[PDB]
Design a protein around this ligand. Structure first.
Ligand SMILES: Cc1cc(C)[n+](CCc2ccc(S(N)(=O)=O)cc2)c(C)c1
Ligand SMILES: [Zn+2]
Length: 258
């Protein structure tokens, strides 16, 4: 049995198979807004998802992935603290069993109901595989979810979860526009970190948006109906698949605004 989010295989156990879990630039982290400093050397962030092409949605037993075709330059993240172009490969979420928790990054210790992660890899490294062998191989755009009014652009994702309840299942999911998941403002905090799940590789430049999106109680409730287990296995609701905030150590979180 591999890593999970339970008492016997959760976050506090990961360091055993993945020692870097105790590394120098692990994620997530708490964002102390008062300590974060405005950085004028940051260029305007550029998110271009106009040509994005989704392919499939998958339940990997830890969350669900909406995968995109990254064989060409379509859906790229540029500017900000990033040098060059990063290509969108997939997006997934982290959520809790209750609205009071679920996000990985926290704001002044405040936990949101969930957190969306749009994953991109640095195109100068050929592909994802090579990218994860570099300190600047990845860029993840994090967006917080709070419970309130529904998010229209997230519904198509919500309605397909029925077809991928258990680990291993996947369903076709073309023509999904990730632009319908972004808040109005692109203000953000940024810092060098890592993947928040094993292998927990420290190759990520995190870009976390200040403004969160609102989703309905009904929508997040469906996220919670998913399973960690595979078909025909005792049911284990897919909830609280988030890693707690890790030590900041020698890092500074910069703000794109004021
Ligand atoms: C080929 C390939 C193999 C793997 C394991 N992955 C997923 C890796 C991964 C793991 C966790 C985060 S997260 N939670 O956003 O830090 C982002 C990417 C991708 C995107 C492509
Ligand atoms: Zn994630």
């Amino acid at each position: 049995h591999h890593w999970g989010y339970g008492k016997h295989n959760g976050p506090e156990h990961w360091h055993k198979d993945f020692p870097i879990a105790k590394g120098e630039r692990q994620s997530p982290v708490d964002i102390d807004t008062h300590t974060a400093k405005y950085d004028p050397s940051l260029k305007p962030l550029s998110v271009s998802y106009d040509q994005a092409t989704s392919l499939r949605i998958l339940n990997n037993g830890h969350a669900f992935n909406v995968e995109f075709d990254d064989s060409q330059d379509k859906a790229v993240l540029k500017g900000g603290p990033l040098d060059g172009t990063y290509r969108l490969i997939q997006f997934h979420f982290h959520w809790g069993s209750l609205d009071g928790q679920g996000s990985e990054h926290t704001v002044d210790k405040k936990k949101y109901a969930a957190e969306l992660h749009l994953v991109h890899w640095n195109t100068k490294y050929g592909d994802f595989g090579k990218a994860v062998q570099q300190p600047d191989g990845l860029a993840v755009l994090g967006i917080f979810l709070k419970v309130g009014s529904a998010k229209p652009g997230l519904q198509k994702v919500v309605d397909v979860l029925d077809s991928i309840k258990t680990k291993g299942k996947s369903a076709d999911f073309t023509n999904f526009d990730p632009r319908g998941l972004l808040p109005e403002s692109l203000d953000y905090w940024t810092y060098p970190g890592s993947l928040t799940t094993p292998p927990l590789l420290e190759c990520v430049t995190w870009i976390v948006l200040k403004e969160p999106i609102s989703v309905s109680s009904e929508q997040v409730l469906k996220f919670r109906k998913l399973n960690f287990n595979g078909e025909g296995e005792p049911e284990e609701l897919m909830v609280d698949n988030w890693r707690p905030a890790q030590p900041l150590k020698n890092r500074q979180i910069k703000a794109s605004f004021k």
